[PDB]
């Protein structure tokens, strides 16, 4: 499903992402926008054999198990296909684990290249939350 910006902001707020471990809500909307264009079914096959899944493009080498990625660690303890749902629950649970590492949101390459250092609260302005 393709979320609207304000729609996603209100959902991510409901899923407890506003100020989770020091990251204001706008970070998460901005990251979704550049990682997947707000599409919960987005998938991206990498050159190393892994695949990035869903709205936050969570990687099958470290985070979820898709059964086809060589040294998969399955850190979120979840099948990757659970991240391709229009309900964002599993993606948000996994993301909270990811961001609890000392790397924080630098795990998301598009966030790091297009969001960090910008006025990320601009992604939630103009929205009823």
């Amino acid at each position: 499903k393709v979320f609207g910006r304000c729609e996603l902001a209100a959902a991510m707020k409901r899923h407890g992402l506003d100020n989770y471990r020091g990251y204001s809500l706008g970070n998460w909307v901005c990251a979704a926008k550049f990682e997947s264009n707000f599409n919960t079914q987005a998938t991206n096959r990498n050159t190393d054999g892994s695949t990035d899944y869903g709205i936050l493009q969570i990687n099958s080498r470290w985070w979820c198990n898709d059964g086809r990625t060589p040294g998969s660690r399955n850190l979120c303890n979840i099948p990757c296909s659970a991240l391709l749902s229009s309900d964002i629950t599993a993606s948000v649970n996994c993301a909270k684990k990811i961001v609890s590492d000392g790397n924080g949101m630098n795990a998301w390459v598009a966030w790091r290249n297009r969001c960090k250092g910008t006025d990320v609260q601009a992604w939630i302005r103009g929205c009823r939350l």
Partner: antibody
Amino acid sequence: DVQLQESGPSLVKPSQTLSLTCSVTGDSITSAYWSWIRKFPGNRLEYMGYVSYSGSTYYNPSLKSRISITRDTSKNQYYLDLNSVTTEDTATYYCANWAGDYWGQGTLVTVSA
Amino acid sequence: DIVLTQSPATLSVTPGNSVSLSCRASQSIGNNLHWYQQKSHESPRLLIKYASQSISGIPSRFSGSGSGTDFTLSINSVETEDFGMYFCQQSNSWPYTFGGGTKLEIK
């Protein structure tokens, strides 16, 4: 099925370093984030810290930096070192995964001269 | 640090009644609140995560609800195996903290 089990001394002296070990059976230590938690005598729980997959550590500031958590992939164990213990460090210590589903049985450590 | 206050500190109840325990946070923590049970001579057991998400292997009489600062754990029809201590825990901010606990015991 993963199993966790604490070990170390049950009695220590004031000002020494307490060292505990958590052995993991069932999966590799590289597949989770790992933590130490302790329970004081009138049921107060304290989250001590955890080590995540990059090796970064987070420590509770109530411990005033006397703690260190390290892991040993080879032995599939991770450790707790608590320096300069006092009688206030008497407690039951548990290791557990960050997600909170797997806990060891807990070990009581008493600090006394 | 976020402080978590639980109430009541102790609740006595007859098997078969329904009870509700409360956990209040000193700041808004969204849905980042988990509940643990601790029976005598046992290590904590995770019952509910993220305020209301169910966990496989736990009786379905346990349910959780709330957001922001006010959270509740409900036990529909208490059984004798439910007696023990209940704690809430927040993982919104580092250091993670626990509430002081509620003791559930036979009336």
